[model samples]
Target chain A: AERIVVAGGSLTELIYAMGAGERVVGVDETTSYPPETAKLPHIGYWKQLSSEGILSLRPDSVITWQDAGPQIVLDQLRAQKVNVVTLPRVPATLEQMYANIRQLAKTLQVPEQGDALVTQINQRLERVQQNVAAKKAPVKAMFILSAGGSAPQVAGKGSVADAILSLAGAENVATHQQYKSYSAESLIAANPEVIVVTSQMVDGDINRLRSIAGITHTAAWKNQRIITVDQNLILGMGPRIADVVESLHQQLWPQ
Target chain B: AERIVVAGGSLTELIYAMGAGERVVGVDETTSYPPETAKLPHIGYWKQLSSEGILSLRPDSVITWQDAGPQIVLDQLRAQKVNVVTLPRVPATLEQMYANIRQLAKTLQVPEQGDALVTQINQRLERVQQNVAAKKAPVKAMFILSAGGSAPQVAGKGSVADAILSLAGAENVATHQQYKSYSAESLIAANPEVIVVTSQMVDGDINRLRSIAGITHTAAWKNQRIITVDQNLILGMGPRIADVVESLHQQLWPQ
Candidate 1:
């Protein structure tokens, strides 16, 4: 498709990585990677989208996370004869992301770039996992969902952050599933040795994490193990999963 | 217009207060007043709105703040033959609100209630301003714009809360324009006799404001004078402005 509109961040990163970046006519607010995507026509958030806004982009193909939609907007787009490709939103594994890349590579018809990029990501993933296997006990880490500001939430269970943390060899202290609010008191209970907050969530400022009450008392705070990784790399599980995984492993098992 | 989609909370309050609440089929996320607007079809935030969501509501007319737009979506609605009424959003005066009431009353086809509401609002406004006039040293009051969580801000010049607080008779400590973030030491130095954080900012719990540092040492905290009023009444300057003004005045100049 000459004019593609992607609703999720990972898809945008994958498309860009697969050398189909020029085909993307628009992207959701979540997309900030590749820097050039910044110049693309801006669509609203993927979940609560505007059909009219998407239509305004005049996209030939709309590729989105299956979870993307008011359903109304997607249907309206489909009703208007727009070709919509929705991939599964299962963010629990690297395998699902590989499948996403596989499907989009076929859709974009750039099989060579698609296969090569996946090989690159997997190779790095293998390396990181291999290194992580070297350490028996994973670092007790916590991923604070820091964007929304006031309410602090921890990534647990099937959350993308949790997935990344698990692969990066960190023991997430949060037992609760998905993203749930945590308090200052809760922080004392879960004494994480290392902490990571996404850069995309806090306007590239990791110091903001220092202000989150119980975070200061964390061993992460004491050891200076607070890590600020790119939001997309951790949260989106895009083509850059290897990059994040490697960096996180290095942070956890510092030399 | 029986099926009305109002993008502004003040307009939603106007329609409901005018007894034409039945005409409202949908409202923007900001319209959580009147307790009934919660049930209305959510049309997303006004600025970054969803056209299909509004269209799905099948509104006879879309009444909105002049600033309410992605511009493209509103144009799309207009192109689709939807009657879109855009109004001024200057929230610096009671005069503007009265005019808004007059306009919406005519639009909703309830002239009598429109006139009645303006009269009632004016009567209350006059009484509060008069009560405020009885005090010589307008209490140094500050309105903290609390919601977005991590940041602490004060409503200064030109903001709706500033207009409401200015009307309620208080010396606004913030000489700056609009809402600006403040720090803990700054809070103690300003030393507001009473602090009013809008209930809309912190999810029905004024105790959340208690966590904000430096607030505990202020005169307002020492005197147990922190107030939480309905957000719309203060921020939207809608039909309940009189109520917020009176209550805020009482909190500041307690009996």
Candidate 2:
């Protein structure tokens, strides 16, 4: 399993974070966050992958999210007796996040590194707690999916966006289960104090945030308290949860 | 497959819409959109399901979103030779929505039903467009996730909320992707003319919406223009998209 070909974006970055990038021989298109990983041989999109392309890599082990295949392709890989390690996708709870790291480390044969990473992440979590506890009032925040349209999708409970917002000590404004699109008038009524958006979530220029529908009528756009984070960093909760907490903490409690 | 277990609410409703309710042996808790579907055996939350529970029903096939699973459960089901069909989680575009219906129809062995349902949905969409096109000016609107919290969530692009708003000929003010909390100042800045919320999206009484954050300062709250829709109707897309569009259109242009 020394030569590993990873499929999903989070696992590719996690493998690198676990100090095993050298063993990686191939990756998918979503593995573009870490600029250096671009040099790896490209396989294809995770879900639309071909067994022929993956088998061509001739790697020792293939790792990906469980959701990463057209069943037929995965069946073909298993038929060839190739080692296919599919990790659980993103975890919603803190404990689940830890469990995923341990599983990855165990399967990648780097248990020690996994434990160390988990310990480090736990420390970051503690710092986040302390920072959050210090806040006099919780920041009202929301995570928007896209801003170019009349209705914007919002992250709600059971979502990574909700988890991240809670971790950063901001109350998630969206109270529905998962993600739901919101209307302009409803947004004005909810009145978020701060707004967070991923760079990729927008259709046009990020600066045009002020001009989108009723944005100017809300507190976030008026105060210009919009926070931007990379989609991978916030959505992919691994060792990076620490960084996400720190970054969001700064925005939520700006001096 | 004579007996099917559906994981998503919209998919469950879609199965019923395709006139295949007799084949549904089990449904997740989220599948309560049709009201009568509640009579079916609850298989627990879709993402937190157990293989033992799902397999006990002796379902012919398990239909779910690609994102729905504990991963381990899905693996065990596959190992036990269960037919698992995972569809794309949500449709991002109009074409994708139609494609989803067709794929589901093909999988359920109901191609004709799929075609018929697609036609019906297209007709509704056309009616929605006609209704919206008649509007002199787009209604400045927002969809609130819940009214109970200090900060409420709103919808943005790539969401059914946005799609419904656009179809209803209104402008969404949230102006960000997904759901993000807006500060009081931001909400005041957005100044949406109307607000929409589901009865369940509110944690406490719907009346609490006025006190949430910036609701009182907005045109919607001042004019008492808050509109409430059934949670299942607005959030569930599929056969109800036209209904949602029509309902919101009336609210947006109550002349």
Candidate 3:
């Protein structure tokens, strides 16, 4: 179609990667990769969307994550008879990511290229896994949402960050569901070898580790093993996920 | 908006370079670059196109050079009401090349990228011109189509080969329009200092130079000053035209 609205960061990057970014007329706040989509009309955040704002863009199709909006807004959009395609949100496995890409490709009427991209991603991820497996031991890692002396939320089971850490040959030490605030006692007891923080949290400041409660006493803090990756790269599973996983592997098993 | 058929080598290359190749449904016989498009279905040659073959591919749009078909084929395609966009056949000047790129970019709905590509091409051409202008004397040059024991056709005016020669700070020796077969008497009278041939003409057989009538008698053939460039690079004014110009300038004014 001539005009389209994309409502997720991972979906936006996929459209651009598939070489159909020109058709996108509007994007949600989370769609930031490829950098060219920064100027597109923002249709609000993915989970909190405005039907009026999205409809104003006059898009022929709306591609989003299944959890992109309240059911009421989605129902209203459907009532308008717009071609709304929603993919499973935050793919936590390679298979899930491949299916998401293929679904969008079929929606965009470019299934062949979508299949090719999926194959390429699978090959790259497989190579990265083999390389990481060759290492002597997996690193004990903990993904922290914030280290600003506030309630520290760490990635646990069923989270995209946790999946990325596993792909990078790291064992997630957080014993909770999804994301939960961890106590200083929990941090010390888990004894994570590396504290993984996003680039957004670090902002070029390596001393952010000092702000986390009782972090100075942990092995990761004492050894200065706090590593930073782009928040999007860690939380979104797209074509660039393989590159991020490869980079993380090198950092975790540096020679 | 989804399925597109490209009908020329240069047009195919431009579509792929602009990141819209994923939407291409099929290509004409001329397209062979980017290596990935080799498996794409080939409709027919540009000048003698097959309307039935093209329509069978179910293309939403057909992009080709202005002189693509035998008029009858074009009329039939237009009858089917497919979006037919014909760009200028050969962009023999830098301005024409820029305009052509912008037109395709606009057609592809990525005018911003098209503008950026034009700016890059302009800057590169300007640099090549500056470097070529610094040389003391301009070389007299002639571009031969073939040296296969037959009358050689030399580029004259309003041809990509002629334009490239001027860009390289060389004087055209042929006093004809477009391209004309060079007579032995005319070849001797022109007395070019340098000869240019495409990679196709040479075909790894440099001995063809001896087959061209009266070529050995000229200063260029006698001194082995013939240079071979990739046929696609010299003939098509696409994104890589500046690189071709730069290399031609270096070959013409070697330090």
Candidate 4:
């Protein structure tokens, strides 16, 4: 069998979901699900990467998300007779995730594998649906990516952030505006019960975040709690999205 | 002891760092730094929250990141005599991190404790300096926050994402501006040598990013290898920042 090196998280998961995990000899850091993906040789980071590393891997074909390029590098890869297939980034919605899975399956020539994985994801989502339906308390959550800046950016409605909050059984406080930068007053006006910062900004300590100019004396600080989630899982909408929702659900509902 | 409920990751880490870990009656998800903090009782996300749930904690005080609130709730907490303390959400540079640490100590009325912890942080930071200096090959890298979008939202220069990247002994390739959104063309234009995403985005294998609508692929993606990192540890910058830098240095220069 020709060596196929998977490059993104979705492709790695899709390969396994398509029952083709054994074909991958390398993975980017984003790949973790289906277990064995971690065992492969690592190349480097996604955007600021080098060709030498990939060339070192000697892969026959590379399957990944679309952003994997520089016209020159892609051209070079083509010149080398390497196959590069790019998949879609999963959006915040359930449908988008499924569609992406199907697309990945198609790339791997394992549509049935995608079907099985989709079934598993759907089953888990159903459990979340049941819990959400049964829950008596739901909190409004603000998805804060990084709160250290002057104007905090929130996950507005109709966004992947909003979708994750909804899936976790919490309301997204940010209104539907595509990646809106919010004012201090705007946040104060919203008066949410909870705040969720994706894992991407996990570097700051809670104290550092709370002390942002407008945040220290707010009701949220005095009363409500803030949560941190793995951005990759919560925001990525990959194979373990159900797990992300379940984690949030557990935090919010506790019962 | 005050019946105050402490929340947020850094505050919780600070509380624990200041020997006030016992004061934490509950915490938000951000408090997952020490590993043990994950076991704490939850208050939910930070920004969109409820007064009732927070009041139910029976807390005398609440501490979180500054931007945690949406307004009315803050007013209500004040009206109700609830002490709300939101920490500053500043850049995660060492300066900001240290200043916030001092502020937290002051807020707790334990200045001495704060000083001690600051000293410890400085010591660790010194170790990180050593780590960075120790790197054999300082590769160029980018810290991506959300790559799912069409343009791939990334943390550019002047952002905490960049701050952490600098500490790790790697250079950021998106030099056009700080925290700017790059089109696929721009990303490829940057011609970065390395790319770093959250480990969760790795998805179980190596792969390419799907192309954004209005831009062409970058030379960076096609030729270079991509990597994913455990976002929590890398971004957390809590007590493990030095470790993150050391790890990155090792990865970039394994010798």
Best by DockQ: 1
CAPRI-style class, candidate 2: incorrect
Worst 10 residues of 3 chain B by lDDT: B145-154
lDDT of 1 by residue, A1-255 (tens): 488889888889899999998988877766667777644544566876768768877889899989897898899999988999999978668788888888999999988888898899888888888888887888888887533233346788899899889888888988988866555567657888887876644555544444354565667778788887765566677877877888888878877
- Model 2 complex DockQ against the native: 0.02
Docking class of 1: incorrect
Residue A236 in candidate 1, Cα distance off native in Å: 1.2
Give the alpha carbon lDDT tens digit for every residue of B126-226 in model 4: 77668677656667877654432212345666666677777767788766545454543455566667777666444453331331211114444565456
* Candidate 1 interface RMSD, angstroms, 1 decimal: 8.3
Cα lDDT listed for each candidate:
0.75, 0.72, 0.75, 0.62
List candidate 3 stretches off by more than 4 Å: A147-151, B1-255
Q: Under CAPRI classification, how is model 3 graded? A: incorrect
Output per-candidate TM-scores for chain A, rounded to 2 decimals. Answer: 0.90, 0.87, 0.94, 0.80
TM-score of each model, paired residue for residue? 0.61, 0.50, 0.49, 0.48
Those runs of model 4 whose alpha carbons end farther than 4 Å from true positions after fitting are: A1-255, B130-138, B147-151, B176-180, B208-225, B234-236
Of 1 and 4, the candidate ahead on lDDT is: 1
Question: Distance from true position, residue B24, model 1, in Å?
Answer: 27
The pairs that clash in candidate 1 are A150-B149, A150-B150
- TM-score, ranked from best to worst: 1, 2, 3, 4
Q: Is candidate 2 or candidate 4 better by TM-score?
A: 2
Candidate of highest TM-score: 1
